[PDB]
Amino acid sequence: GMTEYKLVVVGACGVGKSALTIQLIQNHFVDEYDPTIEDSYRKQVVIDGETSLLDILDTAGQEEYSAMRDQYMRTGEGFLLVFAINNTKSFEDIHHYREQIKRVKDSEDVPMVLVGNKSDLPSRTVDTKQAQDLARSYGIPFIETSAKTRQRVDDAFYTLVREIRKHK
Numbered sequence: 001g002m003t004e005y006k007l008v009v010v011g012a013c014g015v016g017k018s019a020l021t022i023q024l025i026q027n028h029f030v031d032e033y034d035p036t037i038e039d040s041y042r043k044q045v046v047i048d049g050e051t052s053l054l055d056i057l058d059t060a061g062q063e064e065y066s067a068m069r070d071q072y073m074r075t076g077e078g079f080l081l082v083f084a085i086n087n088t089k090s091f092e093d094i095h096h097y098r099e100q101i102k103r104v105k106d107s108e109d110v111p112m113v114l115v116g117n118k119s120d121l122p123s124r125t126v127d128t129k130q131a132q133d134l135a136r137s138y139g140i141p142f143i144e145t146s147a148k149t150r151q152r153v154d155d156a157f158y159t160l161v162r163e164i165r166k167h168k
């Protein structure tokens with residue numbers, strides 16, 4: 001059957017996890033998406049000439065351990081670590097999420113990409129150097145995105161797919 005990639009999008013409330021995922025699948029920018037709705041989404045893509053089906057968990061709600069999140073964390077192949085460039089706390093929260101994923105994987109070498117979202121906004125509080133430093137510390141790529149303009153959205157997901165290929 002068609003190759004699949006199981007992806008997980010994680011990050012603080014409000015950073016744009018749903019908006020990024022909706023842009024990828026639908027090519028529309030959502031100004032409001034219910035923060036409680038945790039679901040998976042599927043998209044057929046072609047990346048470096050390979051047709052595949054992405055299976056993407058948009059994490060949401062507060063109720064952490066849940067049938068769905070548990071199975072995607074245990075079986076997920078790659079993770080997008082999303083913060084917003086106007087949300088310093090969301091950047092500070094990234095290390096927590098990376099630590100929890102590493103503990104589920106019992107591994108230091110999990111495919112991940114750091115995503116700094118909301119690049120269209122004036123109110124930057126996390127500088128690109130802070131992002132780049134963090135990603136280099138972790139050994140992973142950094143991609144700047146805007147779900148509003150769509151800048152970097154494909155690049156983020158495709159880079160994650162390329163990172164999974166490099167690992168397996």
Ligand SMILES: *CCC(=O)N1CCN2Cc3cc(C#CC)c(-c4c(O)cccc4Cl)c(F)c3OC[C@H]2C1
Binds near residue numbers: 014036062104
């Ligand atoms: C605004 C609502 C929303 O989008 N979310 C609420 C905050 N969530 C934070 C968050 C926390 C953890 C944890 C822990 C301990 C994890 C997680 C879990 O649950 C299990 C294994 C690995 C990790 Cl990283 C999150 F994925 C996560 O991101 C979701 C965010 C959703």
Ligand SMILES: Nc1nc2c(ncn2[C@@H]2O[C@H](COP(=O)(O)OP(=O)(O)O)[C@@H](O)[C@H]2O)c(=O)[nH]1
Binds near residue numbers: 012014015019
């Ligand atoms: N300006 C701008 N707003 C965004 C961007 N991404 C998300 N938003 C907005 O930020 C809010 C939170 O987005 P959402 O996708 O619900 O975040 P989630 O809680 O991580 O799923 C919503 O009002 C979105 O429209 C972006 O790149 N730029």
Ligand SMILES: [Mg+2]
Binds near residue numbers: 034059
């Ligand atoms: Mg959401």
